[PDB]
Amino acid sequence: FESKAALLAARGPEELLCFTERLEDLVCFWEEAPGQYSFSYQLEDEPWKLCRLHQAPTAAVRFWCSLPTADTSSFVPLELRVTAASGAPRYHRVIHINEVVLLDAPVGLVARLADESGHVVLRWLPPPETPMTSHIRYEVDVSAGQGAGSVQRVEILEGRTECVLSNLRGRTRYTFAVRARMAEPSFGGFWSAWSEPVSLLTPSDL
């Protein structure tokens, strides 16, 4: 899961980062440049427990806690606490698992020339085996060549998996890409990685 970690580790230099992938798991991690630490948590009103803390070096060392599946309850306050071996405190967060979701990248992107000239119809599939697909909202990126870059970003409402793009110049090679995230207000998290892009060339205008 290093890819998602590094993606999230960009948005945060030295903070305790937590995220869930399929709502039945939770990973909290942080990076340092050595030390010994203990990870304690409290699910709602249940007694405090400890999490087995793993560690591995990154290009420097990264500590992460993979929370036990049995305590992966959403919609309830999960108090987190990272404490050093010397007893000195380090981190302290009260998160909700349903508010830190990091889905996989959407797949099956295909582009087609629509009916109205200058229009392209995008169709894609939600991330493979992802819970509650109708609560996933998307974002489509339209990039043009010749140094133009991103020319359009359309926000797709939750549940919809098709997008009809308008105002596209002919004889131009566009490149489309989609990313996903869980929708408000019963969820929250971070944008997924961009899907494998799909290009399409428009013909001339008659």
């Epitope: 039945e24 699910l43 009103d45 249940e46 049995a70 305590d71 992966t72 309850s73 309830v76 819970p131």
Partner: antibody
Framework: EVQLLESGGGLVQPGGSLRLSCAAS????????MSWVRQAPGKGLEWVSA????????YYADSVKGRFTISRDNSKNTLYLQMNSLRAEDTAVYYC?????????????????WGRGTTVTVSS | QSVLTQPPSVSEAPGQRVTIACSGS????????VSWYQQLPGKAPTLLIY???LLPSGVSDRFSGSKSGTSASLAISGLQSEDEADYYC???????????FGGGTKVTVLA
């Protein structure tokens, strides 16, 4: 793998009392929460009561408050349901249901394992 | 009655396709995870479909779940006689603060 065995309950009269028991095995009992779900004909399933992993937090339906009492023994891997002041409408099949997480509620998303279920009959 | 609404009985010929509706509101199915349960006659209810559309490990490929607005659906393609049972839909409610279930649907298979 997971096994839940209900016991207790039978035929009684209005005002009677019973004590249901769930013999749990195949998983770490004290790490998960448990629930009681009853099935009356024409009433479908109903969430009767539920208790957390440590037993600190408890929930009761509005129709069984004060008459029912849920509890658990983590040392014996057993879930209890103390039923007092029974009424005619309490007549249903009571299922022992294991929750997905340590606290039963919205964040559970679904009920994990059910039991064979014991029947509670209340009539004259 | 039940907060969630299912058709009481559904009959269909073997090998065909069966659709079981489960209508609710904006407080139940609208913004909460729907789960489906199968109860074979005289046996314990089993987890059939969770997370609206996901399929539990061990459940036949013939079962599939979908969700549109305030109504969820269970699909049984390639209907067999072994599938003859009772199917319940369940979801959390936010107006009320507990689990709600459907009346249940008894799928009957002809010959």
């Amino acid at each position: 793998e997971v096994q839940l065995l209900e016991s207790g309950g039978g035929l009684v009269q209005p005002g009677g009392s019973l004590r249901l028991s769930c013999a749990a095995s195949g998983f770490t009992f004290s790490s998960y929460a448990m629930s009681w779900v009853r099935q009356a004909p024409g009433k479908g399933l109903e969430w009767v009561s539920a208790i957390s992993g440590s037993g600190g937090s408890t929930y009761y339906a509005d129709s069984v408050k004060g008459r029912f009492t849920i509890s658990r023994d983590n040392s014996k891997n057993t879930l209890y349901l103390q039923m007092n002041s029974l009424r005619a409408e309490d007549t249903a099949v009571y299922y022992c249901v294991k929750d997905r997480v340590a606290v039963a509620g919205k964040g559970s998303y679904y009920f994990d394992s059910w039991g064979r279920g014991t029947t509670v009959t209340v009539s004259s | 009655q039940s907060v969630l609404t299912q058709p009481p009985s559904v009959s269909e010929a073997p090998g065909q396709r069966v659709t079981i509706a489960c209508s609710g509101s904006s407080s139940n199915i609208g913004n909460n995870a729907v789960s489906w349960y199968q109860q074979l006659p005289g046996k314990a209810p089993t987890l059939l479909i969770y997370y609206d559309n996901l399929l539990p490990s061990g459940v036949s490929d013939r079962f599939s779940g979908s969700k549109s607005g305030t109504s969820a659906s269970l699909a049984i393609s390639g209907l067999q006689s072994e599938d003859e049972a009772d199917y319940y839909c369940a979801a959390w409610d936010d107006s009320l603060n507990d689990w709600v279930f459907g009346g249940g649907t008894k799928v009957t298979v002809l010959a």
